[PDB]
Design a protein around this ligand. Structure first.
Ligand code: NAP
Length: 296
């Protein structure tokens, strides 16, 4: 069936549907709405679609109902199995998309998963990019995300206006899976920079140092990091909320270690970080921010 007009003209070929209105997806979709690209949203939990319905965005009943109404589907759900459900489940994107739709997975998973999604979607004549992001919840809210993209270079270029609504530095990394590969590199660094912060704070509190001065010194050379700038003021206030959930970093480190074993590289720091965050999930703190490691 054909459908009535929505917020974004059909002739633009740039109607976006957004799936996953979480800590990152809510602000990212709001940015696409401010820029005039957002036509529709889907969220598993309906209440989070409310603020978008109040601004006239269509709230779909399923990923398939969303895909039939848009040119570009952006997915920002938790993990690879979640992406599988929203693309390939009974009422997934592939059950409503027309050939020529583009799926952009902006969640974090792995190069292998990106290539699998692309291969499966190409059976339906659906295009795919992996475009994971860094900059945290603050970057999402401010629209300043760094977005790292794998797929057809032509499609990177066609979607650049959509990526610039959500982010600032938009980097084309290479073929499918190269955005996830860059993200796995990024998440090695983020995890170990976060363990750096939490161990420095544990030592500073054991030494009885003035936290005002500890924050002053650390917020500078070359101890200073993104993880300190984004999270040390929440940590010092005892605000353990995400931020970035510990269960999601555990997931990212699992993919890092799988890729390192495939390639014959030993990453003992990433292995330790995985163990630490695995324990944090087993202890029941998987939904706290990664900065609560050591303090939960
Ligand atoms: N937070 C950060 O700092 C950050 C930074 C960069 C990248 N990331 C990556 O971005 C992705 C999203 O992270 P987030 O922080 O936004 O997580 P989040 O706040 O936990 O939100 C996850 C979202 O995914 C939806 N979802 C999860 N499983 C699903 C399923 N099977 N079917 C349908 N929807 C499902 C959730 O729906 P409900 O609302 O129903 O729960 C929610 O909208 C993750 O891959 C994460 O690693 C996060």
């Amino acid at each position: 069936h054909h459908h009535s007009s929505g917020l974004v003209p059909r002739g633009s070929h740039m109607r976006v549907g957004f799936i996953g209105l979480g800590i990152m997806g809510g602000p990212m979709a709001t940015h696409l709405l401010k820029a005039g690209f957002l036509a529709a949203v889907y969220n598993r939990t309906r209440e989070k679609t409310k603020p978008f319905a109040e601004a006239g965005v269509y709230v779909a009943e399923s990923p398939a109902d969303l895909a039939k109404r848009v040119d570009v589907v952006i997915v920002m759900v938790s993990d690879a199995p979640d992406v599988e459900q929203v693309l390939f489940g009974p009422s997934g994107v592939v059950e409503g998309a027309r050939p020529g739709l583009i799926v952009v997975d902006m969640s974090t998973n792995s190069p292998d998963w990106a290539r699998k999604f692309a291969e499966r979607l190409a059976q339906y004549g659906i295009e795919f990019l992996d475009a994971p992001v860094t900059g945290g919840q603050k970057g999402a809210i401010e629209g300043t995300l760094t977005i790292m993209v794998g797929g057809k270079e032509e499609l990177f270029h066609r979607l650049l206006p959509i990526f610039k609504a959500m982010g600032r530095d938009i980097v084309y990394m290479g073929p499918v899976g190269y955005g996830q590969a860059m993200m796995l590199v990024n998440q090695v660094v983020v995890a170990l920079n976060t363990v750096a912060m939490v161990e420095g704070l544990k030592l500073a509190k054991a030494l009885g140092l003035d936290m005002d001065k500890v924050a002053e010194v650390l917020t500078r050379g070359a101890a200073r990091s993104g993880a300190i700038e984004l999270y040390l003021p929440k940590l010092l206030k005892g605000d353990l909320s995400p931020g970035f959930k510990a269960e999601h970093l555990k997931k990212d480190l699992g993919y890092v270690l799988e890729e390192a074993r495939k390639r014959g590289v030993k990453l003992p720091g990433a292995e330790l970080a995985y163990e630490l965050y695995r324990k944090m999930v087993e202890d029941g703190a998987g939904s706290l921010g990664i900065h609560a490691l050591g303090f939960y």
